[PDB]
Amino acid sequence: LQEALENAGRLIDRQLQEDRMYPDLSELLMVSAPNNPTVSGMSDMDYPLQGPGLLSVPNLPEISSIRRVPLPPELVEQFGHMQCNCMMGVFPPISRAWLTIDSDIFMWNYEDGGDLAYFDGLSETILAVGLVKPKAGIFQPHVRHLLVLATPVDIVILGLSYANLQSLSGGMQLLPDPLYSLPTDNTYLLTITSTDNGRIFLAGKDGCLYEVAYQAEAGWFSQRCRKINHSKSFSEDDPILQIAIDNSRNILYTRSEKGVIQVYDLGQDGQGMSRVASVSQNAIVSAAGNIARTIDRSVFKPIVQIAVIENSESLDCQLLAVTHAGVRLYFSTCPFRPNTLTLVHVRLPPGFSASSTVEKPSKVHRALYSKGILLMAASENEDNDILWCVNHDTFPFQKPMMETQMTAGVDGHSWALSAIDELKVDKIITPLNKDHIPITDSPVVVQQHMLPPKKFVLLSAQGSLMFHKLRPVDQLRHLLVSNVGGEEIERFFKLHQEDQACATCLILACSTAACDREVSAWATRAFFRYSGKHNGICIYFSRIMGNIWDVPCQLLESVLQELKGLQEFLDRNSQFAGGPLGKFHEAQLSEKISLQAIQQLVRKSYQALALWKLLCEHQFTIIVAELQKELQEQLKITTFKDLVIRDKELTGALIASLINCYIRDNAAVDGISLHLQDICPLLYSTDDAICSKANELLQRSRQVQNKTEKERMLRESLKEYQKISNQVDLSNVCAQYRQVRFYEGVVELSLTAAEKKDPQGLGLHFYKHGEPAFQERLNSYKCITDTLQELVHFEQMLKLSQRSKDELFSIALYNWLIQVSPFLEPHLVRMAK
């Protein structure tokens, strides 16, 4: 009820909410600080660079180069005959790769070198090509995607179907919706991004951002694509660079050639967006001159990239903006009474010069540090871009101005960049997050396994070089690997504090022993060689089990499936990392107890999944909503902390009521294995007692009828298939069988009660002794007494008691009546004389 297990549980709950106290970054950065320090300088950041083309591999990079795919030879062939349109890019929501070519669409997928799916129909140039989510009311539901294309006539939508091919990718099938068109004016349109609903908003070489509604109305007197701008900002020079949307608050952020942002909330219409004002970067720089950071140094950089910061990411901050000086500018969009915003925070890159692949002697300058645009601009060279990646530094929470460092210097021209893990958050309003509230949305460490690692496909001038935005466990385990020999063991603690350390150790060791035995060995050595090791156990199994305790059963399903996955992966790939499947003293003993806890947690997952799977298979009361009777939405109950160790007797009752229905037939032994591999705890209820039986008779009566057919079936179920029924005290059982007119149910149950309970007939001298029994069977006798009294099924029950196997079926009501037969015969006559 209340032992060290549940107590360390609430303890790790407290640590969870403590880890949660980042708040959100609006607090980690205390952006309420109106001043310049919310800006993250260079005193706070190292820039480790190792240069392109040498065997050195960075062991603390937030990203890691993985694979490179060329461009379609056919694509190159046309692109040579392409004459005006050049925008390479990747579409994360399909993982497809594209290059905006002169006019048409012959579009490929990079992972396999997918065919550049050909369409030679267009006669007017695509300034750009976009990927949009299929908006309801337009398409056949199997339409997974659509294609939006520019023409000197207009913009157009091209439906698509992305089902997986012979995940690698979902293969695309052409869909034709050619009526999408309207020629009006000479605006250029290239800024093609879209939200969850699938809004098409287009600006281009000129700043005119029209929200195209793509509509199932194939044009009749005006073609099917119409351009609708929120241009309530007349902006003579607006080579608008890009656009950016805040789905978590229905807000849009644009970067003009000057980065200029106009306010945009999704207007009251529900399909358009309402703009009222315009903010240029001049606002930000005036605020910067006022913000007490060196501003004449800040001046002047033109804004060349932006990156939304949704409210899940930061309470009030809107977006990260990146200039030609690469300066990471973080702005807010909100209504004073997103109309009014305030400038506080700007992340500066580190100060380690990007000059040498070779380590130049590292540097620390905690005084206000700053370095040249040479190291501030990623694409320092006009031909060879230097890919720069970062997420936030969790463990540096007290060092919140720190960020995760890396260096991806390459040789091609980067043109498009986004996450493919942005896809797992594409349909939803949030970007990469780790919570449903702004707090704990950043900590990759907490969700680094329940969702696949952050990966990246970075389009290059000759293809795309694929990256994986590295996890705490990724860079960690590889620093584990890196130890061979800053100090890795020392630096881990510097980031992992022997609690996050040991958690990733145990979590990492158990997880990698299936695929990388020696990474498990590294982590195990790390943790083993109020404790922080026990705190690592707490953290690990809490990130495991709060998916029942505090997160939505969604992470529950994620973790259970990935448990089965690591299990079977270790199994079938048993050829690489073997062993799990069947002074140094104190170190190994911490190690021993910890790995035993690991394997116990594994078998508990497997044991839990089967029982959990069995419980799921039974689905008792889950559908209750479908069956009504004042019960609804059982799925939420599963979400609530009740599945693992907090509901036990009601759980037993639920799985008895599931068993009574027995939707599965020829599935008893499956149940038996669970019973003999899950009822192993002896001093407990191997099967719940009373509402189990009452619940079983509900389903037993409803699922099947003994009287119409299969009556011995329900009796023998009651015995074996519904063994959870028999053992009952004075309870619901009475009414629960009262509905039955016959007495084959209650009588059968009391007979089984006599089998499992009454060893040999001392019930005789219950009274036949005299002056020392009735109790705990008076319930059944009592139930029989009222049913028959109100009855006089019953007429066919006269052959039972008369031919009862046990005399208990021959004594109770006869005594009952006669106070108001050589079994009661002595009681009477000897009681007489």
UniProtKB/Swiss-Prot annotation:
Keyword Disulfide bond on this protein? yes
Membrane protein topology class = Peripheral membrane protein
Subcellular localization: Nucleus, Nuclear pore complex; Nucleus membrane
Cellular component GO terms held in the UniProt record:
cytosol; membrane; nuclear envelope; nuclear membrane; nuclear pore; nuclear pore inner ring
Q: In which tissues is it expressed?
A: Expressed in all tissues tested, including heart, brain, placenta, lung, liver, skeletal muscle, kidney and pancreas.
Q: Which UniProt keywords apply?
A: Atrial fibrillation, Disease variant, Disulfide bond, Glycoprotein, Isopeptide bond, Membrane, mRNA transport, Nuclear pore complex, Nucleus, Phosphoprotein, Protein transport, Translocation, Transport, Ubl conjugation
Altering R347H: what's the impact? In ATFB15; fails to accumulate at various foci of the nuclear envelope and is diffusely distributed in the cytoplasm; shows significantly reduced permeability of the nuclear envelope compared to wild-type
Give the record's glycosylation annotations as residue positions. Answer: S482
Q: Give the free-text PTM comment from the record.
A: Phosphorylated. Phosphorylation and dephosphorylation may be important for the function of NUP155 and may play a role in the reversible disassembly of the nuclear pore complex during mitosis. Disulfide-linked to NUP62. The inner channel of the NPC has a different redox environment from the cytoplasm and allows the formation of interchain disulfide bonds between some nucleoporins, the significant increase of these linkages upon oxidative stress reduces the permeability of the NPC.
Q: Does the UniProt entry include the keyword Phosphoprotein?
A: yes
Question: GO molecular-function annotation terms?
Answer: structural constituent of nuclear pore
Indicate where the modification Phosphoserine is found in the sequence. Answer: S821
What processes in GO biological process is this protein linked to? atrial cardiac muscle cell action potential; miRNA processing; mRNA export from nucleus; nuclear envelope organization; nucleocytoplasmic transport; protein import into nucleus; protein localization to nuclear inner membrane; RNA export from nucleus
Record's subunit section? Interacts with GLE1. Able to form a heterotrimer with GLE1 and NUP42 in vitro. Forms a complex with NUP35, NUP93, NUP205 and lamin B.
| Protein family (similarity comment) | Belongs to the non-repetitive/WGA-negative nucleoporin family.
Q: Which disease is it linked to?
A: Atrial fibrillation, familial, 15: A familial form of atrial fibrillation, a common sustained cardiac rhythm disturbance. Atrial fibrillation is characterized by disorganized atrial electrical activity and ineffective atrial contraction promoting blood stasis in the atria and reduces ventricular filling. It can result in palpitations, syncope, thromboembolic stroke, and congestive heart failure.
Q: What is the role of this chain?
A: Essential component of nuclear pore complex. Could be essessential for embryogenesis. Nucleoporins may be involved both in binding and translocating proteins during nucleocytoplasmic transport.
Task: State the protein's name.
Answer: Nuclear pore complex protein Nup155
Q: Which gene encodes it?
A: NUP155
Q: Which residues of the full protein are shown?
A: 19 to 1069 of 1391
